[PDB]
């Protein structure tokens, strides 16, 4: 579903150039829960930015759903960004003058889906992340664990192609993180929707199927898991990290 071919990007201030991509090439098929991790000073966050449309590419080719966007006009590029490509941010990005239902129905208001269809779709989404009991609650009354699930429920409402999650489980305890990832993985299982996630918590990355170890703009192979127990893959990624 994703096709990248030697995409270039150099961070510079018009006088000194600091290259950070060094020959990447990634292929993704539909319905895989891929994870990207490795180091701290590497360009994995810049990788996640450049795979989406937020950052313009120096030299390369990007094919999403067959369509091409490397040579694409700005207005239609923003359009394409709007009708696909759900996002999950590090920060909540909730509006405090709207309730939960209003917050996760706001982006759907442009497409003009009447009332019955939009209300039914909100019920269908919010019954499955366990927030249907908070239909009329302002954000500043509920715990920090539930607001991330609200943001995810907002991102999974118009059924896009790719979900570009950026470290969701960053400020949570064990219970909230475990619940959020269990719900996210079940949601991925039920509906065919690829999820691309950049994470640092190895237990969080344990739920994934394919792991890409970006190391200074290099592939450095990629684990593939398979049909094994969660703890076996967890210890495998432990020893792989210990290698680094």
């Amino acid at each position: 579903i994703l096709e990248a071919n030697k995409i270039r990007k150099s961070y510079g201030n018009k006088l000194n150039k600091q290259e950070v991509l060094k020959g990447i090439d990634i292929h993704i098929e539909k319905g895989e829960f891929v994870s990207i991790m490795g180091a701290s000073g590497s360009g994995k966050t810049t990788l996640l930015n450049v795979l989406s449309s937020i950052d313009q590419v120096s030299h390369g080719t990007i094919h999403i759903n067959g369509n091409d966007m490397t040579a694409m006009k700005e207005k239609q590029l923003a359009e394409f960004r709007k009708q696909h490509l759900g996002f999950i941010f590090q920060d909540y990005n909730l509006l405090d003058t709207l309730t939960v239902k209003e917050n996760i129905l706001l982006p759907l208001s442009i497409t003009k889906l009447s009332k019955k269809e939009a209300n039914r779709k909100f019920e269908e989404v919010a019954k499955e992340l366990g927030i249907y009991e908070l239909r009329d609650k302002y954000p500043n009354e509920i715990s920090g664990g539930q607001k991330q699930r609200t943001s995810a429920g907002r991102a999974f409402i118009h059924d896009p192609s790719i979900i570009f999650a950026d470290e969701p489980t960053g400020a949570l305890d064990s219970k909230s993180a475990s619940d959020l990832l269990n719900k996210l993985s079940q949601l991925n299982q039920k509906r065919n929707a690829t999820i691309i996630m950049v994470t640092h918590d190895p237990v969080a990355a344990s739920y994934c199927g394919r792991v890409i170890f970006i190391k200074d703009g290099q592939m450095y192979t990629q684990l593939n898991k398979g049909g094994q127990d969660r703890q076996t893959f967890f210890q495998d990624i432990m020893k792989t990290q210990g290698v680094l």
Partner: protein, 635 residues
């Protein structure tokens, strides 16, 4: 670094941001200069009417300076409060308070005094135009000249220096006391208070729609009604801003579910919450705008009907009381080469009773129903109707009477003679007057009786209430021609101003109401400008408080076009509510008592309201630009 460049950069930044403040200062200084110059201009003595002349311009000046002072003081107390962060920082760095006062008060004595110097120099250019505008309305033929009138220069310098002293005193207190170095669900109460506003607004309207009706018919039972209506409507407005906006907006929001557009999330997330914070301001704006529109509309309505009421108060082009004066005026006219159609008609005055014909209430007496004074004329004198015995026809319309005195169809009319009473019946009501107002008392019509009964009425001659002159000698004029020589002949006929003319009773009213309408129009313009500036200066803070919201909304894909498209409707709602409430107040103020003034409405009132709205919408149009400048830089 050096202080001076910091001061200068601050002054440029202030001058760019507040340009409506400087425009209002220049406009106000110009108008004060113009009025004080026009007060001392000797040609102001040509305006002849009951009002003293140049004693109304002084009242206009006194009233104008109060509005200007209030606007200035309030604007500066808004301005200072937005520099609390900088005062705190300068106090934290170490520098004292008598060093912050000399920074933030040495860049207002530049802006204020520069605009004051521009205002005097641009008030010398507009005075002749103001004077000619005045002369055109009151219809005088004179010459306007361009002169400086160095009294108005002094009288402006002193006034605006005093107001500036007051501003400095008000700033010092805030700087001194701010040395601390300090860097949602509706209730039951806000429901009762919300409904009480709507309930108290309409009670005033309903009591107003009766007023001069079947009740309150007493000289001392009227002030109570007026006080009740004013108090009710003002309190209803104040409580309408503090709670009835939240009520309606809350209903509208919790009747849509959660499916909201961007227009509604931009509008209803601020109209519910910040409109209530300004309730002692929008109240004043709405009520005072209502005063301006209503007073101007009434003054204008009393201006067209001057010609009609002058033609009605005197039936003929000249009305005469003495035979010798009439004969000498006719002798003068004889060599005037003007043929005058003289007619005469004796008048007999008696009393009757038509209390049966009143369809209203017995409280509408206006005197004794059986002993009220009327004027009786013969049928041979009237050349338009030929009544018979036992029939009476009323003459004239007198629009005031139709709204107070209600007349039914034919009944029985009793004539209170010395020893007899011949019953008559009411046939119909005419519309053309026959007798000048001196004979017919205030506005009582004139009856028509048969000549046969006239041969007995003139034989009776009840000598109890008869007037000094029971004759209507009144001279007419030839076709529409040069009548000014005839007029001046008339004023040289009479030296005791005891003779009435059509051309002179239609000039005093025109002059008086033209002067009132001129003054009221200029004060209304000044208030419009100042109110627009004040309402503009608060949207600035409202916009800067929603800067984070724009940023968050722009990470979900929304582009600047949609944000500005929502801001347009938000500004429409923010700027239209006070105007609409004011327009409703003004319409219900004009319609209650227009008949006391003239006989024409909906011609003047529509154009007055259109002018007000068209000149008021500019400030609403100028705020979307600031919202755009804020939106762009919140990536």
């Amino acid at each position: 670094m050096n202080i001076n460049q910091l001061i200068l950069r601050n002054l440029k930044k202030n001058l760019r941001n507040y340009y409506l403040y400087v425009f209002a200062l220049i406009f106000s200084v110009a108008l004060y200069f113009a009025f004080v110059t026009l007060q001392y201009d000797p040609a102001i003595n040509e305006v002849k009417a009951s009002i003293k002349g140049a004693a109304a311009i002084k009242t206009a000046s006194i009233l104008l300076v109060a509005v200007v002072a209030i606007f200035i003081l309030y604007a500066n107390t808004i301005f200072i409060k937005r520099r609390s962060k900088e005062i705190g920082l300068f106090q934290l760095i170490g520098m004292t308070k008598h060093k912050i006062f000399r920074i933030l008060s040495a860049e207002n004595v530049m802006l204020y005094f520069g605009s004051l110097a521009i205002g005097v120099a641009a008030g010398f250019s507009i005075s002749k135009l103001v004077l000619m505008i005045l002369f055109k309305i009151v219809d005088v033929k004179a010459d306007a000249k361009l002169h400086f009138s160095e009294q108005a220069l002094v009288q402006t310098v002193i006034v605006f220096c005093g107001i500036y002293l007051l501003i400095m005193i008000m700033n010092y207190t805030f700087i001194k006391k701010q040395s601390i170095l300090s860097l949602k669900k509706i209730s039951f109460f806000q429901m009762l208070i919300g409904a009480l506003g709507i309930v108290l607004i309409l009670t005033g309207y309903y009591v107003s729609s009766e007023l001069f009706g079947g009740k309150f018919k007493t000289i001392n039972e009227l002030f109570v009604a007026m006080s009740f209506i004013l108090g009710s409507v003002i309190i209803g407005t104040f409580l309408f801003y503090k709670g009835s906006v939240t009520f309606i907006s809350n209903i509208i929001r919790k009747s849509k579910g959660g499916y909201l557009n961007i227009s509604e999330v931009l509008s209803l997330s601020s109209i519910m919450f910040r409109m209530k914070s300004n309730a002692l301001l929008l109240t004043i704006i709405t009520t005072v705008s209502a005063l301006a529109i209503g007073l101007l509309s009434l003054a204008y309505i009393s201006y067209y009907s001057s010609e009609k009421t002058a033609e009605q108060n005197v039936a003929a082009d000249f009305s005469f009381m003495n035979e010798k004066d009439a004969k000498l005026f006719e002798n003068k006219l004889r060599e005037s080469n003007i043929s005058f159609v003289k007619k005469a008609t004796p008048v007999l005055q008696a009393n009757v009773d038509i209390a049966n014909i009143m369809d209203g209430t017995p409280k509408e007496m206006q005197g004794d129903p059986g002993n009220m004074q009327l004027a009786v004329v013969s049928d041979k004198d009237v050349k338009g109707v030929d009544v018979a015995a036992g029939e009476a026809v009323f003459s004239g319309y007198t629009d005031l009477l139709q709204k107070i005195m209600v007349f039914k169809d034919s009944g029985v009319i009793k004539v209170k003679s010395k020893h007899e009473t011949q019953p008559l019946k009411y046939k119909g009501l005419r519309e053309e007057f026959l007798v000048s107002y001196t004979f017919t008392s205030g506005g009582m019509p004139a009856v028509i009786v048969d000549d046969s009964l006239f041969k007995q009425l003139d034989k009776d001659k009840d000598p109890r209430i008869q007037l000094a002159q029971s004759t209507f000698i009144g001279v007419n004029v030839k076709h529409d021609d040069q009548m000014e020589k005839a007029n001046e002949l008339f004023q040289q006929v009479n030296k005791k101003n005891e003779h009435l003319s059509r051309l002179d009773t239609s000039a005093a009213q025109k002059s008086l109401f033209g002067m009132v309408m001129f003054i009221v129009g200029f004060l209304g313009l000044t208030f419009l400008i100042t109110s627009g500036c004040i309402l503009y200066f608060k949207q600035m803070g409202e916009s800067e408080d929603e800067k984070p919201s724009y940023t968050i909304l722009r990470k979900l894909g929304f582009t600047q076009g949609d944000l500005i498209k929502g801001i347009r409707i938000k500004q429409m709602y923010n700027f239209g509510i006070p105007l609409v409430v004011g327009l409703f107040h003004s319409y219900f103020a004009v319609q209650s008592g227009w008949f006391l003034f003239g006989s024409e409405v909906w011609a003047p009132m529509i154009m007055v309201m259109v002018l007000y709205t068209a000149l008021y919408s500019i400030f609403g149009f100028l705020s979307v630009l600031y919202y755009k400048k804020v939106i762009k830089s919140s990536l």
